[PDB]
Design a protein around this ligand. Structure first.
Ligand SMILES: Cc1cccc(Nc2nc(N[C@@H]3CCCC[C@@H]3N)nc3c2C(=O)NC3)c1
Length: 274
């Protein structure tokens, strides 16, 4: 990244004392050209510096309604990454605390995530941390994809990112090829999107509960998958299962996934109007 292009003035930023979550994320206020903009700011407490700047560099290149926009960066008390504020917070925590949210509403939100990911796929970026905790709600009917700290811009000549070693990975969201070959593609993100869908229809329950990472790998290798959440429409569980296709080449891309979700969402909108 070249800070010059996206550099913010610390004097124009006001940070809240409390933390939103955890570097650490805090609520803030940035004085824009005229309006004041409520922002979410990722702050640090050499390696961690480069990871934040890499995250900023990814976000800078993305421009989509369903992805959190970066406002800019600043080096003050630490390096800070200033982003759009999603006031209602992470999807998993929201659904845990709002069990009244309807099927149609959940379908709407996961469809928005699929539109964001279709865009990410078109742009040849891999997210590598697509989970309900990293989908943030602007409103009850507007979700954005966040948290690009593990995200990678794919090389012009390859469809995957090859990781050098097994780091601190959210293994329960990872496709077999991520675990077995360290290869991350948009198809690996589709696998993760399946788990995210399961989380959403389970009202933010953790996937594969009570199981170790190695036990999940063993379960998947036997062809076993998580069951249908209570009250989850069959069409949505069928889509989840398709996202959990073992063979990467036969697994659908986000274009196919988004189209399926889009069509089903219109069916449900029809059903509710009747
Ligand atoms: C009300 C509320 C509660 C918690 C977080 C947010 N907002 C954001 N959080 C993240 N990242 C955190 C990291 C820790 C786990 C959860 C999230 N994945 N990122 C961005 C926000 C935000 O508003 N814009 C970007 C808002």
């Amino acid at each position: 990244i070249r800070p010059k292009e996206v550099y913010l003035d610390r004097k124009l930023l006001t940070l809240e004392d409390k933390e939103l979550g955890s570097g650490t994320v805090k609520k803030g206020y940035y004085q824009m050209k005229k309006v004041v903009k409520t922002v979410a700011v990722k702050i640090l407490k050499p390696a961690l510096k480069d990871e934040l700047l890499a995250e900023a560099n990814v976000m800078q290149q993305l421009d989509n309604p369903y992805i959190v926009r970066m406002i800019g960066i600043c080096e003050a008390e630490s390096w800070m990454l200033v982003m759009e504020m999603a006031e209602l917070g992470p999807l998993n925590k929201y659904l845990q605390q709002n069990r009244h949210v309807k099927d149609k509403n959940i379908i709407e939100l996961v469809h928005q995530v699929s539109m964001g990911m279709k865009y990410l796929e078109e742009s040849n970026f891999v997210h590598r941390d697509l989970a309900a905790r990293n989908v943030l709600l602007v409103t009850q009917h507007y979700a954005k994809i966040s948290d690009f700290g593990l995200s990678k811009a794919l090389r012009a000549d390859e469809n995957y990112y090859k990781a050098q070693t097994h780091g601190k990975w959210p293994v329960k969201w990872y496709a077999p090829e991520c675990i077995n070959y360290y290869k991350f593609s948009s198809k690996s993100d589709v696998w993760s999107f399946g788990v995210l869908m399961w989380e959403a229809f389970s009202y933010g329950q953790k996937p594969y509960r009570g199981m170790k990472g190695s036990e999940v790998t063993a379960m998947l290798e036997k062809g076993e998958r998580m069951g249908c959440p209570a009250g989850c429409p069959r069409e949505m569980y069928d889509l989840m299962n398709l996202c959990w296709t073992y063979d990467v080449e036969n697994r659908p891309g986000f274009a196919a996934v988004e189209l399926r979700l889009r069509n089903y969402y219109y069916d449900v909108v029809n059903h509710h109007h009747h």
